[PDB]
Amino acid sequence: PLTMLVEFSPNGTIIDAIDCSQDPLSELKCTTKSFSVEKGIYQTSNFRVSPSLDVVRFPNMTNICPFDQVFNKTQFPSVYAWERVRISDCVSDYTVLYNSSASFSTFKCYGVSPTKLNDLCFSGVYADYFVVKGDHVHQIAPGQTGVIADYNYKLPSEFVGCILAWNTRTIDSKRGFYYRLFRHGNIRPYERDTSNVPYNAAGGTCNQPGTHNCYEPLQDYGFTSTSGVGYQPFRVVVLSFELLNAPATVCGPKQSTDLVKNKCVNFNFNGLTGTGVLTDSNKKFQPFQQFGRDSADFTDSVKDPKTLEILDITPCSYGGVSVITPGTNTSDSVAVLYQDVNCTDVPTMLHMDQVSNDWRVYAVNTDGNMFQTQAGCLVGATYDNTSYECDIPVGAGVCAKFQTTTRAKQSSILAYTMSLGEDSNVAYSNNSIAIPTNFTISV
Amino acid sequence: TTEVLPVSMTKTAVDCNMYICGDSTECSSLLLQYGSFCQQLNRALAGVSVEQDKNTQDVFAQVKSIYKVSAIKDFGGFNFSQILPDPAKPSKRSPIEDLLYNKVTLADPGFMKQYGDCLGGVNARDLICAQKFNGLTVLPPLLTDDMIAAYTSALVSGTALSGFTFGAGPALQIPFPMQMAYRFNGIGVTQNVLYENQKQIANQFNKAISQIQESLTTTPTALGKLQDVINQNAIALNTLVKQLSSNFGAISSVLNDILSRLDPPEAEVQIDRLITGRLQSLQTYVTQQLIRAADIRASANLAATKMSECVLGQSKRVDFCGKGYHLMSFPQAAPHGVVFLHVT
Amino acid sequence: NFGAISSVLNDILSRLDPPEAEVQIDRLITGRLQSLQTYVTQQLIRAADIRASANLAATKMSECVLGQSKRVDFCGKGYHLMSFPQAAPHGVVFLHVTYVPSQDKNFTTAPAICHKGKAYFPREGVFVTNGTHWFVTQRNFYQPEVITTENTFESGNCDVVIGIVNNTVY
Amino acid sequence: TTEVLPVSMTKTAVDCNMYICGDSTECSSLLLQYGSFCQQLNRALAGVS
């Protein structure tokens, strides 16, 4: 996998292509988007280093979440008296639900994609469960109306979690399942009403149901074995999720790998994914904190869920690199400037062990082609102790020009200090004066 | 009398990918479909950066001869010691430029270039470090301060040797009191009034230059057009970084939390709301920088014309080289600017 | 594309229906308006830079060409004499004619010349000598003239001043 | 002979919240997540003034 720059013909045939990760000149060509470069100094993007391996680390737990207890075992309640349970410390491998008799007919999720459920870790999970009828199943969703969504069970508008429903004709076709049908006003999200007081349609109370304007507030579903498909009993489970800066309690089935340090890698810490370099840290966290973020919302620290140590993350290309060229119509030689970097730590900044062979030439001293200026460390040029007039500005009083070479072990681009002008030998005098004798007419 | 004029501002550079998408192949792939907004946002910033060196070159480097004069010399009663570089003392600057360089609070000289490290030694969180981690870099000027201060020493020692003949041709030596008598003839006054009261003109002159020091070393202000140049660059570079923390209406401000919970089709509607806000922030930054550069160029041109008409000549324009009738002017280097001393 | 399914508006209106096409047309309109905005605001900024140079050229044509200027580096390097304008595509080219001194020689000088107790200072010029002979001359071209009563101003006594020399003040 | 030259412009000020969101709590609470786009839009107009 690599990226290339390609040039087409006016009739539509491929006539040229370059690989951008090969050498500094190719990097400059790919950054500029041209096959020929003029003279000067340019700033390039990063096409040198790409990550190779993957670091994934998850908690130590192995026990599977209780899917049997909440799906095949519990006896289920009515909708007005709905029940809630908490799930903690388990691995959420839901493939074990394929061998069961649930036979889900409605599986629909908000604030979650089904295909990422295996790569996520949650700070908290709640499960609500109850029984409704077939025509009432579509009312269990945020932002709905009806009798169930107004008087029995209401979801908040900013819900995050999944909803499951399935038919239970052969086990729940009996009497004793009720729902509320009369009430003064609507209920608020995640609220319960278990009262069984007589209802008066004028606005007050009563003392006995059945007389004028007084009714029972609860109605029986009346499930029988010969009902239509819309009058059958259905079991419903709603799962609510939380994702915060807190210890993970429910995690998916992923395999952990080894900690690889001081290399540009892809990482996954408890579902927090990224790319960069991982090193040791001297930062301090609060006891229930999992990562740290800076002023630009860049995650700079994270703790290991296995060894409990705090590590730091740095980007794979942090400083700017510049390339100096005299023109592609003249030579293919280039020089490289590493801004604000000392020549002793160039190898550990470029990640020498992860770049192409041609790139390691620009990171080792060899025969005096590496030298230090006040703008950074410059590689690929030979320093001259005499001063000229500036041609290509490198910076901090240093310029560069082209030279045809003879002595081998000597580079073809010359770096020097800029000259301010020629000295004058006019001396002060207190009794003499110089006066011109002729003149010149200039245009 | 003093006059302060700014000449240049700091040079900055931006990496589009690192600022907008960070290290995320997915985001990168998508940015390609918004076109050349990013090879167009770099050319403007590069032009602004290459203009700032020509600004300095048009003000300081107009004489290509280095003249040298000893500062302890007599000159007929004129001291010239607080304006010409010290002879022994290590400093290559003068006693007034050394005081000017200690009254502007430059903003960071470069961590990894000043014994600094954005790794471990990032302190609680150095502003500079957050900038480099996000694609914003500052480039150094081409002319060094020790090398700018060399042009000003050759420009003051050229008027103590030749007058204003070095600015129309070769330098022609003249005695200093004979040069000051030519300048009195230029404002309408006869040559004898200088030869007859030379010792009091050489004392009023000496006392006036010895009082600019203790009018700058106490008062903190009046170098207030050079400090704003630094402050506006700092508060504008720091406002760009603190804007990568906004969600611009999506589920989060982090892109690795939209790609850890949504699938290829629905993540793209949320990663477009962020690629659109972060492009607008950058566009705003560069359109404000382009406008500021145009205001700096007018002052650079005015400084360049004052260096030619007030220092390499005597001007008859009324309020151009001070308040009164003009005799001489001296340049002194100041950070990002220039200070003119006018004699009247 | 700006995120939409295509950059061709007639491939969105051929495959999608009135409701879900306006969600994809808007994302092209927004980008295509932003491009025009960028072009116009970069053109306005460039017009301001061209106007300053045009004003400088207009000033220089009235001062350097319809007159002789005494500001030093405004009509070339030297002492300005004349200028000629020539037309160039989108611009103008000035040819400046200037006077540049050359072939200097050194002389010995004095501030005043003393005669009969009174002191004589120059009206405009310098005093020079060849050796036991004193003249007054102009600073831009060596032309020694004999000392006399209209190129010399008398005022004072032969003291106080330093460097004063004694000679005939015809 | 006469010569005319302008020297000054009328100085104006804008309210970000009033112009964008009118009087509305929900719009105001939604405008806080767009950053400092009008804290920065005020300093420019103040300097011009």
Ligand SMILES: *[C@@H]1O[C@H](CO)[C@@H](O[C@@H]2O[C@H](CO)[C@@H](O[C@@H]3O[C@H](CO)[C@@H](O)[C@H](O[C@H]4O[C@H](CO)[C@@H](O)[C@H](O)[C@@H]4O)[C@@H]3O)[C@H](O)[C@H]2NC(C)=O)[C@H](O)[C@H]1NC(C)=O
């Ligand atoms: C939390 O508890 C409080 C306290 O119990 C509760 O407040 C009550 O809310 C109800 C509903 O709004 C109020 O009841 C109304 O009172 C008027 C009095 O005139 C009646 O007219 C109303 O009945 C009308 O609407 C009926 C249709 O549903 C019609 O059939 C009828 O003819 C009337 O038009 C109704 O009974 C009650 O007064 C307050 N009690 C107070 C304020 O003390 C609150 O609603 C509860 N919140 C939740 C969400 O459970």
Ligand SMILES: *[C@@H]1O[C@H](CO)[C@@H](O[C@@H]2O[C@H](CO)[C@@H](O[C@@H]3O[C@H](CO)[C@@H](O)[C@H](O)[C@@H]3O)[C@H](O)[C@H]2NC(C)=O)[C@H](O)[C@H]1NC(C)=O
């Ligand atoms: C699909 O569902 C069936 C039925 O629930 C699962 O069969 C059950 O599998 C477990 C695990 O192997 C069996 O546990 C075993 O029990 C025996 C004693 O009965 C014990 O000696 C073993 O060590 C182990 O504990 C369980 O008995 C078995 N039950 C039946 C009725 O077969 C099956 O495992 C499920 N699918 C898969 C592939 O897990």
Ligand SMILES: *[C@@H]1O[C@H](CO)[C@@H](O[C@@H]2O[C@H](CO)[C@@H](O[C@@H]3O[C@H](CO)[C@@H](O)[C@H](O)[C@@H]3O)[C@H](O)[C@H]2NC(C)=O)[C@H](O)[C@H]1NC(C)=O
């Ligand atoms: C509180 O707890 C009591 C006891 O569990 C609940 O009482 C039960 O209420 C139901 C009605 O909701 C009664 O069913 C009815 O019984 C009568 C005969 O008694 C019958 O004629 C009706 O058709 C219906 O079947 C049930 O008998 C009754 N049981 C007892 C022991 O009282 C009460 O409902 C609970 N209150 C709530 C809802 O919190």
Ligand SMILES: *[C@@H]1O[C@H](CO)[C@@H](O[C@@H]2O[C@H](CO)[C@@H](O)[C@H](O)[C@H]2NC(C)=O)[C@H](O)[C@H]1NC(C)=O
């Ligand atoms: C997660 O499991 C690993 C492997 O069992 C634990 O690592 C061991 O921890 C003990 C106690 O610190 C050490 O003596 C062993 O040398 C470790 N083994 C290895 C291979 O590293 C680890 O402590 C567990 N983490 C938690 C949070 O319980």
Ligand SMILES: *[C@@H]1O[C@H](CO)[C@@H](O[C@@H]2O[C@H](CO)[C@@H](O)[C@H](O)[C@H]2NC(C)=O)[C@H](O)[C@H]1NC(C)=O
């Ligand atoms: C020229 O000016 C300097 C500075 O005023 C005179 O030297 C001394 O300088 C120190 C500070 O560097 C002052 O504290 C002294 O009071 C100065 N002494 C005197 C006598 O002024 C210097 O003497 C002056 N003379 C020359 C060289 O022309």
Ligand SMILES: *[C@@H]1O[C@H](CO)[C@@H](O[C@@H]2O[C@H](CO)[C@@H](O)[C@H](O)[C@H]2NC(C)=O)[C@H](O)[C@H]1NC(C)=O
């Ligand atoms: C200095 O200048 C004077 C005036 O020009 C010179 O004197 C004249 O010299 C010429 C040539 O020898 C004689 O013909 C004249 O009769 C001289 N007249 C006067 C007024 O002196 C003098 O020779 C010059 N001296 C030197 C050293 O060149």
Ligand SMILES: CCCCC/C=C/C/C=C/CCCCCCCC(=O)O
């Ligand atoms: C009782 C333990 C509950 C644990 C819940 C935690 C896990 C997070 C998500 C998984 C639950 C949904 C599983 C859906 C299975 C496929 C449904 C279908 O066939 O369409």
Ligand SMILES: *[C@@H]1O[C@H](CO)[C@@H](O)[C@H](O)[C@H]1NC(C)=O
């Ligand atoms: C297209 O142009 C290329 C380069 O000239 C040529 O080699 C090729 O044969 C051309 N093909 C056609 C069909 O024109």
Ligand SMILES: *[C@@H]1O[C@H](CO)[C@@H](O)[C@H](O)[C@H]1NC(C)=O
């Ligand atoms: C000036 O120089 C020219 C060229 O050397 C020479 O021909 C001419 O005679 C000289 N004139 C003077 C005034 O010396």
Ligand SMILES: *[C@@H]1O[C@H](CO)[C@@H](O)[C@H](O)[C@H]1NC(C)=O
């Ligand atoms: C770079 O080298 C200089 C001189 O030794 C030193 O002062 C500075 O701290 C070094 N910085 C780095 C990058 O380590």
Ligand SMILES: *[C@@H]1O[C@H](CO)[C@@H](O)[C@H](O)[C@H]1NC(C)=O
């Ligand atoms: C000129 O300098 C010399 C040597 O210092 C000195 O003897 C002479 O008096 C000085 N003359 C004047 C006028 O300064």
